[PDB]
Design an enzyme around this catalytic site. Structure first.
Site, PDB file in Angstrom:
ATOM      1  N   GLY A  51       0.723  -3.945  -1.634  1.00  7.51           N
ATOM      2  CA  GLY A  51      -0.562  -4.203  -1.022  1.00  7.51           C
ATOM      3  C   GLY A  51      -1.717  -4.118  -2.013  1.00  7.51           C
ATOM      4  O   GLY A  51      -1.667  -3.356  -2.987  1.00  7.51           O
TER       5      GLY A  51
ATOM      6  N   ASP B 232       0.481  -8.671  -1.750  1.00  4.33           N
ATOM      7  CA  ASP B 232      -0.111  -8.966  -0.460  1.00  4.33           C
ATOM      8  C   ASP B 232      -1.592  -8.694  -0.494  1.00  4.33           C
ATOM      9  O   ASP B 232      -1.994  -7.564  -0.751  1.00  4.33           O
ATOM     10  CB  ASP B 232       0.575  -8.106   0.621  1.00  4.33           C
ATOM     11  CG  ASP B 232       0.105  -8.430   2.023  1.00  4.33           C
ATOM     12  OD1 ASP B 232       0.512  -9.456   2.588  1.00  4.33           O
ATOM     13  OD2 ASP B 232      -0.664  -7.649   2.580  1.00  4.33           O
TER      14      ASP B 232
ATOM     15  N   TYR C  47     -10.076  -8.504   2.286  1.00  3.31           N
ATOM     16  CA  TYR C  47     -10.040  -7.471   1.240  1.00  3.31           C
ATOM     17  C   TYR C  47     -11.088  -7.594   0.148  1.00  3.31           C
ATOM     18  O   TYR C  47     -11.457  -6.603  -0.466  1.00  3.31           O
ATOM     19  CB  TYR C  47      -8.649  -7.354   0.615  1.00  3.31           C
ATOM     20  CG  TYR C  47      -7.535  -7.076   1.605  1.00  3.31           C
ATOM     21  CD1 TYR C  47      -7.805  -6.897   2.960  1.00  3.31           C
ATOM     22  CD2 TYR C  47      -6.209  -7.068   1.196  1.00  3.31           C
ATOM     23  CE1 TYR C  47      -6.788  -6.726   3.873  1.00  3.31           C
ATOM     24  CE2 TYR C  47      -5.176  -6.900   2.103  1.00  3.31           C
ATOM     25  CZ  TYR C  47      -5.466  -6.731   3.444  1.00  3.31           C
ATOM     26  OH  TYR C  47      -4.446  -6.581   4.364  1.00  3.31           O
TER      27      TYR C  47
ATOM     28  N   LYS D  96      -4.224 -13.996   3.920  1.00  3.75           N
ATOM     29  CA  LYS D  96      -4.372 -14.101   5.359  1.00  3.75           C
ATOM     30  C   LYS D  96      -5.659 -14.786   5.779  1.00  3.75           C
ATOM     31  O   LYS D  96      -6.711 -14.522   5.214  1.00  3.75           O
ATOM     32  CB  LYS D  96      -4.302 -12.713   6.014  1.00  3.75           C
ATOM     33  CG  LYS D  96      -3.590 -11.629   5.218  1.00  3.75           C
ATOM     34  CD  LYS D  96      -2.972 -10.582   6.130  1.00  3.75           C
ATOM     35  CE  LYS D  96      -2.862  -9.197   5.488  1.00  3.75           C
ATOM     36  NZ  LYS D  96      -2.117  -9.116   4.214  1.00  3.75           N
TER      37      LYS D  96
ATOM     38  N   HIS E 295      -4.320 -13.383  10.093  1.00  6.81           N
ATOM     39  CA  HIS E 295      -4.512 -11.935  10.055  1.00  6.81           C
ATOM     40  C   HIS E 295      -4.508 -11.230  11.411  1.00  6.81           C
ATOM     41  O   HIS E 295      -3.940 -10.151  11.544  1.00  6.81           O
ATOM     42  CB  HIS E 295      -5.795 -11.598   9.280  1.00  6.81           C
ATOM     43  CG  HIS E 295      -5.773 -10.254   8.610  1.00  6.81           C
ATOM     44  ND1 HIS E 295      -6.712  -9.874   7.679  1.00  6.81           N
ATOM     45  CD2 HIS E 295      -4.914  -9.214   8.717  1.00  6.81           C
ATOM     46  CE1 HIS E 295      -6.436  -8.662   7.240  1.00  6.81           C
ATOM     47  NE2 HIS E 295      -5.348  -8.238   7.854  1.00  6.81           N
TER      48      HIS E 295
ATOM     49  N   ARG F  72       1.779   0.674  -1.223  1.00  2.00           N
ATOM     50  CA  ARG F  72       0.595   0.585  -2.053  1.00  2.00           C
ATOM     51  C   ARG F  72       0.286   1.903  -2.742  1.00  2.00           C
ATOM     52  O   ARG F  72       0.134   2.940  -2.097  1.00  2.00           O
ATOM     53  CB  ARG F  72      -0.622   0.141  -1.243  1.00  2.00           C
ATOM     54  CG  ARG F  72      -1.824  -0.200  -2.094  1.00  2.00           C
ATOM     55  CD  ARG F  72      -3.096  -0.065  -1.299  1.00  2.00           C
ATOM     56  NE  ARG F  72      -4.149   0.444  -2.165  1.00  2.00           N
ATOM     57  CZ  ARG F  72      -4.552   1.716  -2.208  1.00  2.00           C
ATOM     58  NH1 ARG F  72      -4.011   2.621  -1.405  1.00  2.00           N
ATOM     59  NH2 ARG F  72      -5.402   2.115  -3.151  1.00  2.00           N
TER      60      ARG F  72
ATOM     61  N   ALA G  53       0.301   5.280 -11.288  1.00  2.15           N
ATOM     62  CA  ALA G  53       1.430   4.781 -12.064  1.00  2.15           C
ATOM     63  C   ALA G  53       2.735   5.533 -11.899  1.00  2.15           C
ATOM     64  O   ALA G  53       3.811   4.957 -12.095  1.00  2.15           O
ATOM     65  CB  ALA G  53       1.057   4.663 -13.536  1.00  2.15           C
TER      66      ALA G  53
ATOM     67  N   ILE H 219       4.090   4.466  -8.350  1.00  3.45           N
ATOM     68  CA  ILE H 219       4.497   3.063  -8.387  1.00  3.45           C
ATOM     69  C   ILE H 219       5.926   2.995  -8.947  1.00  3.45           C
ATOM     70  O   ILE H 219       6.780   2.290  -8.412  1.00  3.45           O
ATOM     71  CB  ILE H 219       3.550   2.224  -9.280  1.00  3.45           C
ATOM     72  CG1 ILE H 219       2.150   2.150  -8.645  1.00  3.45           C
ATOM     73  CG2 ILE H 219       4.140   0.839  -9.513  1.00  3.45           C
ATOM     74  CD1 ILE H 219       1.120   1.350  -9.410  1.00  3.45           C
TER      75      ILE H 219
HETATM   76  N1  LIG Z   1      -1.749  -7.013   8.255  1.00  6.17           N
HETATM   77  C1  LIG Z   1      -2.665  -6.059   8.413  1.00  6.17           C
HETATM   78  O1  LIG Z   1      -3.472  -6.048   9.340  1.00  6.17           O
HETATM   79  C2  LIG Z   1      -2.674  -4.943   7.357  1.00  6.17           C
HETATM   80  C3  LIG Z   1      -3.232  -3.706   7.673  1.00  6.17           C
HETATM   81  C4  LIG Z   1      -3.185  -2.640   6.779  1.00  6.17           C
HETATM   82  C5  LIG Z   1      -2.576  -2.803   5.543  1.00  6.17           C
HETATM   83  N2  LIG Z   1      -2.015  -4.042   5.203  1.00  6.17           N
HETATM   84  C6  LIG Z   1      -1.269  -4.201   3.936  1.00  6.17           C
HETATM   85  O2  LIG Z   1      -0.457  -3.044   3.637  1.00  6.17           O
HETATM   86  C7  LIG Z   1      -0.827  -2.559   2.328  1.00  6.17           C
HETATM   87  C8  LIG Z   1      -0.600  -1.061   2.277  1.00  6.17           C
HETATM   88  O3  LIG Z   1      -1.191  -0.572   3.478  1.00  6.17           O
HETATM   89  P1  LIG Z   1      -1.507   0.989   3.661  1.00  6.17           P
HETATM   90  O4  LIG Z   1      -2.166   1.530   2.450  1.00  6.17           O
HETATM   91  O5  LIG Z   1      -2.194   1.157   4.968  1.00  6.17           O
HETATM   92  O6  LIG Z   1      -0.003   1.562   3.762  1.00  6.17           O
HETATM   93  P2  LIG Z   1       0.728   2.883   3.262  1.00  6.17           P
HETATM   94  O7  LIG Z   1       1.591   2.523   2.125  1.00  6.17           O
HETATM   95  O8  LIG Z   1       1.331   3.569   4.425  1.00  6.17           O
HETATM   96  O9  LIG Z   1      -0.429   3.813   2.743  1.00  6.17           O
HETATM   97  C9  LIG Z   1      -0.705   3.870   1.343  1.00  6.17           C
HETATM   98  C10 LIG Z   1      -0.698   5.321   0.894  1.00  6.17           C
HETATM   99  O10 LIG Z   1       0.592   5.774   0.436  1.00  6.17           O
HETATM  100  C11 LIG Z   1       0.384   6.632  -0.707  1.00  6.17           C
HETATM  101  N3  LIG Z   1       1.624   6.496  -1.517  1.00  6.17           N
HETATM  102  C12 LIG Z   1       1.964   5.399  -2.194  1.00  6.17           C
HETATM  103  N4  LIG Z   1       3.100   5.597  -2.861  1.00  6.17           N
HETATM  104  C13 LIG Z   1       3.504   6.826  -2.588  1.00  6.17           C
HETATM  105  C14 LIG Z   1       4.618   7.575  -2.986  1.00  6.17           C
HETATM  106  N5  LIG Z   1       5.408   7.195  -3.990  1.00  6.17           N
HETATM  107  N6  LIG Z   1       4.752   8.823  -2.479  1.00  6.17           N
HETATM  108  C15 LIG Z   1       3.845   9.337  -1.658  1.00  6.17           C
HETATM  109  N7  LIG Z   1       2.772   8.656  -1.287  1.00  6.17           N
HETATM  110  C16 LIG Z   1       2.578   7.405  -1.727  1.00  6.17           C
HETATM  111  C17 LIG Z   1      -0.831   6.032  -1.410  1.00  6.17           C
HETATM  112  O11 LIG Z   1      -1.703   6.986  -2.038  1.00  6.17           O
HETATM  113  P3  LIG Z   1      -1.588   7.380  -3.605  1.00  6.17           P
HETATM  114  O12 LIG Z   1      -2.003   6.246  -4.467  1.00  6.17           O
HETATM  115  O13 LIG Z   1      -2.207   8.720  -3.799  1.00  6.17           O
HETATM  116  O14 LIG Z   1       0.004   7.562  -3.768  1.00  6.17           O
HETATM  117  C18 LIG Z   1      -1.660   5.502  -0.258  1.00  6.17           C
HETATM  118  O15 LIG Z   1      -2.613   6.496   0.133  1.00  6.17           O
HETATM  119  C19 LIG Z   1      -2.290  -2.954   2.209  1.00  6.17           C
HETATM  120  O16 LIG Z   1      -2.809  -2.976   0.876  1.00  6.17           O
HETATM  121  C20 LIG Z   1      -2.201  -4.367   2.756  1.00  6.17           C
HETATM  122  O17 LIG Z   1      -1.568  -5.176   1.766  1.00  6.17           O
HETATM  123  C21 LIG Z   1      -2.072  -5.112   6.110  1.00  6.17           C
END
Ligand SMILES: NC(=O)c1ccc[n+]([C@@H]2O[C@H](COP(=O)([O-])OP(=O)(O)OC[C@H]3O[C@@H](n4cnc5c(N)ncnc54)[C@H](OP(=O)(O)O)[C@@H]3O)[C@@H](O)[C@H]2O)c1
Ligand SMILES: NC(=O)c1ccc[n+]([C@@H]2O[C@H](COP(=O)([O-])OP(=O)(O)OC[C@H]3O[C@@H](n4cnc5c(N)ncnc54)[C@H](OP(=O)(O)O)[C@@H]3O)[C@@H](O)[C@H]2O)c1
Lengths: 305, 305
Positions: free
Chosen positions: B22, B47, B52, B81, B114, B264, B268, B271
């Site tokens: 993301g 994505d 955004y 989207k 979207h 997301r 580093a 990731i």
């Molecule tokens: N279609 C829609 O309406 C919609 C809505 C929302 C999102 N999205 C898409 O989904 C993507 C991600 O969404 P989201 O951020 O809400 O989802 P998410 O992955 O549940 O939340 C991201 C969080 O996970 C943490 N994280 C990442 N890797 C990790 C790991 N290895 N261990 C522990 N924690 C970890 C990240 O923080 P740190 O960097 O501190 O690890 C971040 O705060 C967005 O960028 C977008 O592309 C789409």
């Protein structure tokens, strides 16, 4: 530059610059550049907080201007706020000491309790349970207040006050037996649609200043309400009449009624715009007209109230 | 690097990398650096979206790696989207063309609506009345869909799909007379507490992939149930057993049940952590155990539902 850095009295012998500048990002990096542009334009009252996570950035900006001799430490009025997880009498100074370390200032000019509610001490700003619910904790504000007074005595905070306190909470402090120092201010949301006359009048009698935030009215699919305060026709009418902008009349209104406004702009043109606030006056007919807008609407961006 | 960039089939003949990345800030500037670190680590599915306001930043990051020969255009799967203000059949391609111009890519690999709701066309993302209420507009999704199909025909979008569609809205498209191309996916929030079995099963039969967001569970005094999914004891139990992290088991769970997860991290180390997701397997007892967590809780950060 000149009049917006002139001071108003505090009930403890200190004075506070009449127009404050908020420090809340929407890149931390832009905070320091905005503070610098603000200082060059006459701003001497900076408002930050533990919560904002930008005190470091604000300190660098302030100290850059001390170094370049634009301003001295004594010319700057810096405000910080105690966070809720630090409400216990023992953790109060811990909080303040973190701020002093982060900003590299020897003390803060004004330390205020950000909110009356207390949250459990931790490394999280807003701690929650299994069901994701806030871990509140009961700590009597009079206990936190006593800890605050100790901070002022230790000389770590020149003045102490509160923020987001309602009439009963404010009275509680004022009537606490053995009160050593009463708050100098009550920082609350105040604007044309939520003018706080009751609170303002109370403060004037208690000799407490009311500091306003969301003064100018401050992307999602739901919230239905938020009328854009600066689009208000009456406001735009009166701005148009004084050949001013809606934002300056909105700000001038707070100043004329005895409020110390807090504003915030990261735009160099809008920052300079605001310094002209004392260049006109609102005639009473217009003042009453503005008082009429009070529709008691709270933006409560922090969903606290 | 290696397995997380391996592909799964789309119902139109195309294939999509199994793990997506993301692109949503919380400085735009950090997006480009995270995308680059992500690409170097094996990520080939990015994505983003009009909303955004970071597609430019994502394009620079992608093209930096094409230039340095790390990756070719054809190795990258880029999703964008359609925003709600562009739901009218005529404005659909306008929207896509803005994305192509902003990213400098010749086309997008996947274009998806979207949200099903339409908002009036303008220069504002979320337009509102003089009373702070959203200016919705009625545009039949089947009309927007037809416009989408035209995009694919024009070769501007390799594949087309939807996002945030419920069972009836999804059926509406599938049953629209003269359907030319059916959606390849339905991007919805899906995680241990909101697993979407109904939606998943429906998709499997319709041969549509379910792309999850808020996979790992994704502030304010809102006593607003924000249960931290990664702190769940059952999860931590099963992570501890496989000598993995809560986040990897949470991610592995989605993969094993046929979901293409979106993740997301701008860190580093996290990731690189995620690229090891295929290094183990969840034994069925553990799978059922995880299925048990489904408490139907929606984070709905976008306050849409
Ligand atoms: N279609 C829609 O309406 C919609 C809505 C929302 C999102 N999205 C898409 O989904 C993507 C991600 O969404 P989201 O951020 O809400 O989802 P998410 O992955 O549940 O939340 C991201 C969080 O996970 C943490 N994280 C990442 N890797 C990790 C790991 N290895 N261990 C522990 N924690 C970890 C990240 O923080 P740190 O960097 O501190 O690890 C971040 O705060 C967005 O960028 C977008 O592309 C789409
Ligand atoms: N005590 C508390 O609980 C609390 C709560 C909230 C805030 N605060 C304090 O109040 C400060 C400001 O709060 P806020 O941002 O909510 O208040 P606000 O001043 O009502 O809202 C700031 C908005 O005004 C716009 N603006 C600034 N100057 C303008 C001008 N010349 N003309 C037209 N628009 C202008 C700014 O955007 P542009 O840059 O585009 O002009 C910004 O979006 C904060 O930084 C903080 O110090 C305290």
């Amino acid at each position: 530059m000149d009049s917006i850095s002139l001071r108003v009295a505090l009930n403890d012998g200190n004075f506070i610059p009449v127009l404050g500048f908020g420090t809340t990002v929407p890149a931390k990096d832009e905070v320091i550049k905005a503070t610098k542009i603000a200082i060059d334009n006459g701003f001497r009252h900076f408002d930050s907080a533990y919560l904002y996570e930008v005190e470091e950035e604000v300190g660098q900006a302030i100290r850059s201007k001390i170094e370049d001799g634009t301003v001295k430490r004594e010319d700057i009025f810096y405000t910080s706020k105690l966070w809720s997880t630090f409400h216990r009498p023992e953790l109060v100074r811990t909080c303040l000491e973190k701020t002093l370390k982060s900003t590299q200032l020897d003390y803060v000019d004004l330390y205020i309790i950000h909110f009356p509610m207390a949250l459990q001490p931790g490394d999280i700003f807003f701690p929650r349970d299994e069901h994701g619910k806030l871990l509140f904790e009961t700590v009597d504000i009079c206990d936190t207040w006593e800890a605050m007074e100790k901070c002022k005595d230790a000389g770590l905070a020149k003045s102490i006050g509160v923020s987001n306190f309602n009439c009963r909470q404010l009275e509680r402090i004022l009537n606490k037996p053995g009160l050593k120092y009463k708050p100098v201010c009550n920082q609350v949301e105040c604007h044309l649609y939520l003018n706080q006359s009751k609170m303002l009048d109370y403060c004037k009698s208690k000799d407490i200043i009311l500091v306003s935030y969301c003064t100018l009215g401050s992307k999602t699919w739901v919230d239905q309400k938020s009328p854009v305060l600066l689009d208000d026709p009456v406001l735009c009418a009166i701005a148009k009449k004084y050949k001013q902008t809606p934002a300056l009349v909105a700000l001038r209104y707070q100043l004329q009624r005895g409020v110390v406004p807090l504003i915030r702009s990261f735009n160099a043109k809008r920052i300079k715009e605001l310094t002209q606030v004392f260049e006109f006056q609102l005639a009473s007919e217009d003042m009453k007209a503005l008082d009429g807008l009070n529709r008691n609407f709270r933006y409560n961006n922090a969903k606290y109230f």
